Protein backbone atom coordinates (compact mmCIF):
# COMPACT_ATOMS: atom_id res chain seq x y z
CA UNK A 1 0.00 0.00 0.00
CA UNK A 2 1.01 3.65 -0.57
CA UNK A 3 0.69 4.14 3.29
CA UNK A 4 3.41 1.53 4.15
CA UNK A 5 6.32 4.06 4.52
CA UNK A 6 4.25 6.37 6.84
CA UNK A 7 4.33 6.17 10.72
CA UNK A 8 1.11 4.81 12.42
CA UNK A 9 0.84 7.98 14.54
CA UNK A 10 1.17 10.24 11.41
CA UNK A 11 -1.55 8.22 9.57
CA UNK A 12 -3.98 8.69 12.59
CA UNK A 13 -2.97 12.44 12.72
CA UNK A 14 -3.72 13.01 8.93
CA UNK A 15 -6.96 10.99 9.29
CA UNK A 16 -8.03 13.72 11.79
CA UNK A 17 -6.87 16.43 9.32
CA UNK A 18 -8.81 14.74 6.49
CA UNK A 19 -11.96 14.68 8.77
CA UNK A 20 -11.68 18.43 9.60
CA UNK A 21 -11.39 19.03 5.76
CA UNK A 22 -14.31 16.66 4.94
CA UNK A 23 -12.00 14.52 2.73
CA UNK A 24 -13.49 11.09 3.64
CA UNK A 25 -11.78 9.18 0.81
CA UNK A 26 -8.40 10.31 2.22
CA UNK A 27 -9.57 9.78 5.83
CA UNK A 28 -10.47 6.16 4.89
CA UNK A 29 -7.17 5.56 3.02
CA UNK A 30 -5.15 6.85 6.06
CA UNK A 31 -7.16 4.78 8.58
CA UNK A 32 -6.73 1.68 6.24
CA UNK A 33 -2.94 2.30 6.35
CA UNK A 34 -3.14 2.56 10.16
CA UNK A 35 -5.02 -0.82 10.49
CA UNK A 36 -2.41 -2.46 8.17
CA UNK A 37 0.32 -1.71 10.82
CA UNK A 38 -1.17 -4.78 12.52
CA UNK A 39 -2.02 -3.30 16.01
CA UNK A 40 -5.46 -3.27 17.69
CA UNK A 41 -7.35 0.01 17.19
CA UNK A 42 -8.34 2.07 20.28
CA UNK A 43 -12.04 2.87 20.61
CA UNK A 44 -11.38 6.34 19.17
CA UNK A 45 -9.37 4.89 16.16
CA UNK A 46 -12.18 2.28 15.56
CA UNK A 47 -14.70 5.21 15.40
CA UNK A 48 -12.47 7.15 12.87
CA UNK A 49 -12.20 4.05 10.54
CA UNK A 50 -16.00 3.63 10.74
CA UNK A 51 -16.77 7.41 10.25
CA UNK A 52 -14.46 7.55 7.21
CA UNK A 53 -15.89 4.50 5.31
CA UNK A 54 -19.55 5.27 6.45
CA UNK A 55 -19.16 8.67 4.62
CA UNK A 56 -17.64 7.15 1.40
CA UNK A 57 -20.33 4.39 0.93
CA UNK A 58 -23.06 6.79 2.31
CA UNK A 59 -22.40 9.21 -0.63
CA UNK A 60 -22.24 6.33 -3.19
CA UNK A 61 -25.53 4.73 -1.95
CA UNK A 62 -27.30 8.15 -2.14
CA UNK A 63 -25.98 8.57 -5.74
CA UNK A 64 -27.15 4.98 -6.60
CA UNK A 65 -30.70 5.78 -5.30
CA UNK A 66 -30.97 8.97 -7.42
CA UNK A 67 -29.91 7.11 -10.64
CA UNK A 68 -31.90 3.91 -9.73
CA UNK A 69 -34.98 6.14 -9.38
CA UNK A 70 -34.36 8.06 -12.73
CA UNK A 71 -33.91 4.59 -14.41
CA UNK A 72 -37.32 3.34 -13.08
CA UNK A 73 -39.03 6.50 -14.54
CA UNK A 74 -38.18 4.90 -17.95
CA UNK A 75 -41.06 2.39 -17.26
CA UNK A 76 -35.30 4.15 -23.27
CA UNK A 77 -31.49 4.23 -24.29
CA UNK A 78 -28.67 2.57 -22.20
CA UNK A 79 -27.02 5.66 -20.57
CA UNK A 80 -28.80 5.69 -17.10
CA UNK A 81 -28.31 1.88 -16.64
CA UNK A 82 -24.60 2.26 -17.66
CA UNK A 83 -23.93 5.11 -15.20
CA UNK A 84 -25.84 3.33 -12.38
CA UNK A 85 -23.60 0.25 -13.09
CA UNK A 86 -20.39 2.45 -12.90
CA UNK A 87 -21.38 3.92 -9.42
CA UNK A 88 -22.56 0.40 -8.34
CA UNK A 89 -19.11 -1.11 -9.16
CA UNK A 90 -17.32 1.63 -7.17
CA UNK A 91 -19.59 0.97 -4.15
CA UNK A 92 -18.88 -2.78 -4.42
CA UNK A 93 -15.12 -1.97 -4.56
CA UNK A 94 -15.28 0.08 -1.30
CA UNK A 95 -17.54 -2.54 0.48
CA UNK A 96 -14.95 -5.28 -0.48
CA UNK A 97 -12.09 -3.09 0.91
CA UNK A 98 -13.90 -2.78 4.33
CA UNK A 99 -14.85 -6.53 4.47
CA UNK A 100 -11.24 -7.36 3.51
CA UNK A 101 -10.01 -5.15 6.46
CA UNK A 102 -12.55 -6.73 8.88
CA UNK A 103 -11.65 -10.41 7.91
CA UNK A 104 -7.88 -9.71 7.51
CA UNK A 105 -7.09 -7.43 10.51
CA UNK A 106 -9.97 -6.47 12.87
CA UNK A 107 -12.35 -9.48 13.61
CA UNK A 108 -10.74 -11.82 16.27
CA UNK A 109 -11.83 -14.19 19.10
CA UNK A 110 -9.88 -11.97 21.60
CA UNK A 111 -10.52 -8.29 22.58
CA UNK A 112 -13.39 -6.57 24.49
CA UNK A 113 -17.06 -7.41 23.66
CA UNK A 114 -17.64 -3.82 22.45
CA UNK A 115 -14.97 -4.22 19.74
CA UNK A 116 -16.06 -7.78 18.72
CA UNK A 117 -19.74 -6.64 18.40
CA UNK A 118 -18.90 -3.28 16.68
CA UNK A 119 -16.80 -5.09 14.02
CA UNK A 120 -19.25 -7.98 13.38
CA UNK A 121 -22.06 -5.35 13.03
CA UNK A 122 -19.86 -3.40 10.45
CA UNK A 123 -19.46 -6.72 8.57
CA UNK A 124 -23.30 -6.99 8.62
CA UNK A 125 -23.74 -3.38 7.46
CA UNK A 126 -21.30 -3.68 4.48
CA UNK A 127 -22.88 -7.02 3.34
CA UNK A 128 -26.27 -5.25 3.75
CA UNK A 129 -24.96 -2.47 1.42
CA UNK A 130 -23.82 -5.13 -1.18
CA UNK A 131 -27.29 -6.82 -0.86
CA UNK A 132 -29.10 -3.54 -1.84
CA UNK A 133 -27.41 -3.52 -5.34
CA UNK A 134 -27.06 -7.35 -5.95
CA UNK A 135 -29.21 -9.88 -7.95
CA UNK A 136 -29.82 -13.67 -8.22
CA UNK A 137 -27.37 -16.19 -6.64
CA UNK A 138 -24.86 -13.50 -5.53
CA UNK A 139 -27.75 -11.75 -3.63
CA UNK A 140 -28.72 -14.96 -1.75
CA UNK A 141 -25.13 -15.64 -0.49
CA UNK A 142 -24.72 -11.91 0.49
CA UNK A 143 -28.01 -11.81 2.53
CA UNK A 144 -26.95 -15.12 4.30
CA UNK A 145 -23.50 -13.46 5.00
CA UNK A 146 -25.22 -10.36 6.55
CA UNK A 147 -27.75 -12.26 8.78
CA UNK A 148 -24.87 -14.53 9.94
CA UNK A 149 -22.55 -11.62 10.93
CA UNK A 150 -25.48 -9.70 12.59
CA UNK A 151 -26.51 -12.96 14.43
CA UNK A 152 -22.97 -13.56 15.80
CA UNK A 153 -22.89 -9.88 17.03
CA UNK A 154 -26.34 -10.34 18.68
CA UNK A 155 -25.22 -13.58 20.52
CA UNK A 156 -22.07 -11.71 21.87
CA UNK A 157 -24.08 -8.57 22.94
CA UNK A 158 -26.92 -10.63 24.68
CA UNK A 159 -24.20 -12.52 26.62
CA UNK A 160 -21.70 -9.68 27.42
CA UNK A 161 -23.50 -6.26 27.37
CA UNK A 162 -26.49 -4.77 29.22
CA UNK A 163 -29.76 -4.20 27.27
CA UNK A 164 -29.14 -0.39 27.42
CA UNK A 165 -25.64 -0.53 25.79
CA UNK A 166 -25.54 1.87 22.76
CA UNK A 167 -23.56 -0.60 20.58
CA UNK A 168 -26.07 -3.40 21.36
CA UNK A 169 -29.07 -1.03 20.61
CA UNK A 170 -27.43 0.19 17.31
CA UNK A 171 -26.78 -3.50 16.29
CA UNK A 172 -30.50 -4.29 16.97
CA UNK A 173 -31.68 -1.10 15.05
CA UNK A 174 -29.53 -1.93 11.93
CA UNK A 175 -30.34 -5.72 12.09
CA UNK A 176 -34.09 -4.82 12.34
CA UNK A 177 -33.77 -2.54 9.21
CA UNK A 178 -31.96 -5.47 7.41
CA UNK A 179 -35.07 -7.64 8.13
CA UNK A 180 -37.40 -4.88 6.89
CA UNK A 181 -35.66 -3.48 3.75
CA UNK A 182 -33.47 -6.49 2.64
CA UNK A 183 -34.70 -9.93 3.92
CA UNK A 184 -38.47 -9.07 3.27
CA UNK A 185 -39.33 -10.08 6.90
CA UNK A 186 -41.44 -7.22 8.40
CA UNK A 187 -42.41 -9.73 11.18
CA UNK A 188 -38.76 -10.31 12.29
CA UNK A 189 -38.12 -6.50 11.93
CA UNK A 190 -41.04 -5.46 14.23
CA UNK A 191 -40.34 -8.32 16.70
CA UNK A 192 -36.59 -7.44 17.12
CA UNK A 193 -37.24 -3.64 17.46
CA UNK A 194 -40.01 -4.29 20.05
CA UNK A 195 -38.08 -6.89 22.22
CA UNK A 196 -34.97 -4.57 21.97
CA UNK A 197 -36.92 -1.47 23.22
CA UNK A 198 -38.89 -3.38 25.95
CA UNK A 199 -35.82 -5.23 27.34
CA UNK A 200 -33.96 -1.84 27.74
CA UNK A 201 -37.01 -0.36 29.62
CA UNK A 202 -37.32 -3.48 31.90
CA UNK A 203 -33.55 -3.20 32.70
CA UNK A 204 -33.44 0.66 32.75
CA UNK A 205 -31.50 0.54 36.09
CA UNK A 206 -28.47 -0.60 33.95
CA UNK A 207 -28.43 2.70 31.86
CA UNK A 208 -25.02 4.35 32.47
CA UNK A 209 -24.04 8.09 32.67
CA UNK A 210 -21.70 7.37 29.67
CA UNK A 211 -24.55 5.96 27.40
CA UNK A 212 -27.58 8.09 28.58
CA UNK A 213 -27.32 10.39 25.49
CA UNK A 214 -26.51 7.83 22.71
CA UNK A 215 -28.80 5.01 24.03
CA UNK A 216 -31.73 7.46 24.38
CA UNK A 217 -31.45 8.64 20.72
CA UNK A 218 -31.11 4.98 19.53
CA UNK A 219 -34.23 4.05 21.58
CA UNK A 220 -36.13 6.88 19.80
CA UNK A 221 -35.12 5.50 16.36
CA UNK A 222 -36.29 1.98 17.49
CA UNK A 223 -39.72 3.54 18.54
CA UNK A 224 -40.04 5.67 15.34
CA UNK A 225 -39.58 2.51 13.15
CA UNK A 226 -42.18 0.54 15.23
CA UNK A 227 -44.63 3.45 14.52
CA UNK A 228 -43.81 3.34 10.73
CA UNK A 229 -44.26 -0.51 10.58
CA UNK A 230 -47.47 -0.60 12.75
Amino acid sequence: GAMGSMERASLIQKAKLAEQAERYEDMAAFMKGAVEKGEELSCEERNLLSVAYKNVVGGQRAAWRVLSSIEQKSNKGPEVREYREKVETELQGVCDTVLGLLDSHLIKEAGDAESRVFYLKMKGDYYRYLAEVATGDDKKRIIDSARSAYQEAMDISKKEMPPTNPIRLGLALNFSVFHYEIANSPEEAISLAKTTFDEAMADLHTLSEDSYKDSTLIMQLLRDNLTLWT
Partner: peptide
Protein backbone atom coordinates in the same frame (compact mmCIF):
# COMPACT_ATOMS: atom_id res chain seq x y z
CA UNK B 1 -16.18 11.25 20.66
CA UNK B 2 -17.88 9.91 17.50
CA UNK B 3 -19.52 6.59 18.74
CA UNK B 4 -23.04 7.70 17.50
CA UNK B 5 -21.69 8.82 14.08
CA UNK B 6 -19.40 5.71 13.99
CA UNK B 7 -22.37 3.29 14.61
CA UNK B 8 -23.69 4.30 11.16
CA UNK B 9 -27.34 3.89 12.34
CA UNK B 10 -29.75 2.71 9.48
Amino acid sequence: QGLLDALDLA
